[PDB]
């Protein structure tokens, strides 16, 4: 019936993560190893939200540590942003997969179920800017009909979001990895640019 009953009313990030460890909000906690809560401290100005922990993250207990995360770090270095100044997290907290462990897009039901954790992280960190990496992260805050390819690199502000942070959407780093090698320099320039829009929001 949602993560809501499993969410403590606290701004402490460590208490949130520990309690996320006990969530039975949707079925995703069954096959994953552990919940992967975000990383960073409350002092961060910029929050970055991906889709879900992948194979590596599920085992490392940290978000964006696999290939997608390595590419994301290269894009951060190129955008002159430091990762330790950020708060990084995911729309869904448990890794969803089929049988190598193969990575399955979270369903809308799962996304709505896990959203209370994300709201809690936002009320705590109070970012000035949220960066949405990919479609599922973006739909999570902007509705089921939000299309990233149409609105990428635009400073968005929406009513319902806690704190009225600017919101900037972009492609998930793993889209670049999955894309053809010949477009990778233009796609990467695309991600780096959207990140610089977020960083240049005052």
Ligand X SMILES: O=c1cc[nH]c(=O)[nH]1
Nearest distance in Å: CB 184, ligand SF4: 31
Q: How far is the CB of 100 from ligand X (least distance, A)?
A: 15
Q: What is the CA angle 87-89-62, rounded to 5?
A: 95
d(CA 51, CA 133): 7
- Residue 48 is inside which H or E element, if any? strand 46-50
83: helix, strand or coil: helix
157 is in an annotated binding site: no
Residue 66 binds to ligand X (criterion: CB under 6 A) = yes
- Are 151 and 167 a contacting pair, CB within 8 Å? no
- Return the range that interacts with ligand X (CB under 6 A); candidates 52-60, 113-121, 138-146, 193-201: 52-60
Residue of 83, 93, 139, 152 that binds ligand SF4 (CB under 6 A): 93
Beta bridge partners of 131: 48, 168
Complete DSSP assignment for 137-170? HHHHHH-TT--HHHHTT--B--SSSTT--EEEEE
5 vs 104, beta carbon nearer ligand X: 104
Q: Which is nearer to ligand SF4, 28 or 166 (CB)?
A: 28
* Minimum distance, C-beta of residue 155 to ligand SF4, in the bound complex (Å): 28
Q: Which residues bind ligand SF4 (CB under 6 A)?
A: 3, 20, 23, 25-26, 28-29, 35, 92-94, 110, 113-114, 117
Q: Which residues bind ligand X (CB under 6 A)?
A: 50-54, 57, 63-64, 66, 68-69, 90, 172, 174
């Amino acid at each position: 019936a949602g993560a809501q009953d499993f969410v403590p009313h606290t701004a402490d990030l460590a208490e949130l993560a520990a309690a996320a460890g006990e969530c039975r909000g949707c079925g995703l906690y069954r096959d994953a190893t552990q919940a992967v809560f975000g990383a960073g401290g409350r002092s961060a100005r910029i929050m970055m939200i991906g889709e879900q922990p992948g194979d590596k993250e599920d085992l490392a207990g940290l978000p964006f540590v696999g290939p997608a995360g390595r590419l994301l770090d290269r894009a951060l270095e190129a955008a002159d942003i430091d990762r330790d100044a950020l708060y990084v997290t995911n729309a869904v907290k448990h890794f969803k997969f089929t049988r190598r462990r193969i990575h399955k897009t979270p369903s809308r039901t799962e996304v709505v179920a896990c959203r209370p954790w994300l709201i809690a992280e936002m009320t705590s960190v109070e970012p000035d800017v949220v960066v949405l990496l990919g479609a599922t992260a973006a739909k999570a805050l902007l509705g089921n009909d939000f299309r990233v390819t149409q609105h990428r690199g635009e400073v968005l502000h929406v009513d319902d979001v806690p704190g009225d942070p600017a919101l900037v959407a972009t492609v998930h780093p793993s889209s670049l990895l999955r894309g053809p090698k010949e477009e990778r320099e233009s796609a990467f320039a695309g991600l780096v640019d959207d990140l610089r829009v977020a960083a240049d929001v005052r």
